[PDB]
């Protein structure tokens, strides 16, 4: 029946889309489309069988861990970073819920950070669960905890630089 | 989750910003600035990118990455890839 | 602007789902919980009073608006607008 | 030897040349210029040397609204009006003309709009003192709410 | 004129390492920062929230015939013929 | 709660707090609050900066195409074989 994950345009037609979460509702109503144009965060979505009323959306913006240059004092830490994916909202519409919809937007979502990570060094897709229902979703798709704060966890990737 | 007031010394100017908004959406002034507020505190933990970290925490970070994949880990990355999409 | 104001109370009754999310969030930022909800507020309140709904009453009107502003101000559209006026 | 008509913002015009006097309104363009122009939330428009992508000038619009208190009486009112953000012209293009140039774009444009959507009135701060002098000089009037504030009045009926 | 903060360490760090990054003192950039910041809300500056006074002051400012004055001013700004025109 | 204050002093003019006090009192901040923020938000946007990892105008190319490319059974299994 659907169809591809794709980025979001004006055409898509987001009027009636209701996943249980206004804060990832309302996102998608109001900041998705204007932040996907100015380049912040990337927005995809994916659609009934040719309609283009969406069912299903996730945003991806870049970011970056780093090394505190001063971790007192100005000790002996350079300037250290890591280039890296956050995978901010995975929101499913309420009533396609079930219908195993969620998984196969992380499922795409990893394969594309491992499609970037191959041309730029990203090495991890972070996420932030807020609640327990959504951090116990993404660590039974191989999330790890982080280890430098709770609500984050992230799935690692190596490769050859 | 229980119901202790949260005070505000707002400046007289910023409350009324805040009544002719919430006219205009039919809620109260609690109701307002309370759903706006919890919308984008979700947001800023959200859409949080960048992560200046100390060295226990910057290796912790680093030996995360450096990992073989346990036997639970591999397994369930194999039931997310193993999972056919419905547009696949 | 220049001058300095003078204040005016809000007390609301908060669920502790959200004020520990809020908290959460302030303290990522290094706000306090009311300047957090404040300037959380007011920056909802000022989008909300400034949308383009408030004036183009269409989705025409909103047509003629993108396309007016949009148009290069040429002699010809000076001559209409100033022999419309 | 030639300069262009005003256009709005594209993805290919360099911008990195361009130095007018202010640091502020060279970092804006460089930085959040086509990141606003882009989320619609103001609206960028360029001057260019007669065939290159190279910005000499630019400015800014956005909607506005000025609206009344709640707190004689207080039944909610609200007149859109619409905010010229900035105006600048490369320091080397100076003297000659340019800004009013586009100030009169700006007008142009906005009495434009002021017929589809009902804007009332263009609204510039300045905050130099030689900024105020240039638009008071053409047909701006200080506002009575803020000092740093002018008007152009635009009443088509 | 002297700025004195008292800042966070999650803060100070946060601004020292871009300033590092940047060539410019942790001084300079904070005050280029907060300048231009400063700056940028003051020109964008786009809902006004006034009295009544004010905004009967603003619509007589709306009403008012146009003087000589304020006329031939307008003539110069519309009669000068913009070097793309 | 909140957590270890230091200091950060400076000079500077009446050129800068004048303006840097009418946006600080425009949005009822405190000059000492209104830089921090200020400031605090021009670091966190450039140590993003995406050049910073990106590298050159040859992978930026290759980078939206990764980004906005579909992920179909030939570019997931082919994307899956190059991971291998």
Redesign the interface.
């Known amino acids: 029946g659907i169809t591809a994950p794709t980025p979001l345009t004006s055409e898509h037609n987001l009027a009636d889309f209701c996943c249980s979460d206004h804060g990832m509702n309302e996102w998608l109503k109001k900041k998705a489309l204007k932040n996907h144009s100015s380049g912040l965060s990337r927005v995809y979505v994916i659609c009934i069988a040719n309609t283009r009323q969406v069912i299903g959306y996730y945003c991806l913006s870049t970011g970056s861990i780093q090394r505190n240059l001063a971790p007192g004092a100005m000790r002996r830490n350079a300037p250290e970073s890591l280039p890296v994916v956050v995978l901010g909202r995975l929101a499913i519409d309420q009533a396609w819920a079930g219908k195993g919809l969620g998984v196969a937007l992380l499922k795409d979502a990893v394969y594309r950070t491992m499609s970037i990570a191959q041309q730029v060094g990203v090495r991890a897709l972070i996420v932030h669960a807020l609640d327990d229902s959504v951090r116990n979703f993404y660590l039974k798709y191989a999330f790890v905890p982080s280890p430098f704060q709770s609500l984050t966890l992230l799935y690692p990737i190596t490769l050859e630089l | 989750?229980?119901?202790?007031?949260?005070?505000?010394?707002?400046?007289?100017?910023?409350?009324?910003?805040?009544?002719?908004?919430?006219?205009?959406?039919a809620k109260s002034?609690?109701d307002?600035?309370?759903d706006?507020?919890?919308?984008?505190?979700?947001?800023?933990?959200?859409?949080?990118?960048?992560?200046?970290?100390?060295?226990e925490?910057?290796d912790?970070?680093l030996?995360?990455?450096?990992?073989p994949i346990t036997a639970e880990?591999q397994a369930?990355?194999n039931?997310?890839?193993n999972?056919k999409?419905?547009?696949?």
């Open positions: 989750s229980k119901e202790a007031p949260i005070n505000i010394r707002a400046k007289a100017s910023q409350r009324d910003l805040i009544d002719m908004a919430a006219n205009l959406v002034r609690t307002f600035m309370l706006a507020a919890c919308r984008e505190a979700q947001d800023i933990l959200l859409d949080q990118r960048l992560f200046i970290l100390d060295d925490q910057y912790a970070f030996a995360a990455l450096d990992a880990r369930k990355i039931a997310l890839m999972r999409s419905p547009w696949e």
